[PDB]
């Protein structure tokens, strides 16, 4: 459901993978994404992201408005896998467009509204089934996120985890590397899952 007029998000998964033996792998999903949308006023989350030059407010005013989305995540932080050192933490995602582009995906991890980590990945269009796809497979998490997840899991109470997550946000900004044009912007906010179903998500449309 997360698609602008120029680019669609097909998949987004953050996961840890553990090798139990050379022929056995166990994988746990923290978050995952595979209808009309309710609108949320974008002016309300300006404080949860960098608000200087290059910030959400500037980005939105630059437009286009139909490229801005808010995604609430209930992260699954249950240890359903045994772990052990050297486990693999990663993010996998796919995009698609009607037109061939070279895109730049910026992922800004934010603490208390301040950019703490930025990951920048350039991906080149692949013609596939009439359209063009962009695949970022098994992109390794920075040690910051890995340590953050660990800090969260060591907390005795899930309400304590949600307390920490209140000031944790992620801003993904996809641009056409050519024209510097904003193709897709997704703001991420987080909670810990409590349900037996596991990780959950809810998408909102950002309006002004």
UniProtKB/Swiss-Prot annotation:
Q: Where is this region: Transcriptional activation?
A: 1-208
Full protein name: Transcriptional enhancer factor TEF-5
Q: Which cysteines are joined by disulfide bonds?
A: none
Whom does it interact with, and what assembly results?
A: Interacts with YAP1 and WWTR1/TAZ.
Note the superkingdom of the native organism: Eukaryota
- What is the annotated role of this protein in its UniProt record? Transcription factor which plays a key role in the Hippo signaling pathway, a pathway involved in organ size control and tumor suppression by restricting proliferation and promoting apoptosis. The core of this pathway is composed of a kinase cascade wherein MST1/MST2, in complex with its regulatory protein SAV1, phosphorylates and activates LATS1/2 in complex with its regulatory protein MOB1, which in turn phosphorylates and inactivates YAP1 oncoprotein and WWTR1/TAZ.
Organism field: Homo sapiens
Q: Which gene encodes it?
A: TEAD3
Q: Where in the cell is it found?
A: Nucleus
- Identify the tissues in which this protein is expressed: Preferentially expressed in the placenta.
Fragment boundaries within the full protein? 219 to 434 of 435
* Signal sequence extent: none
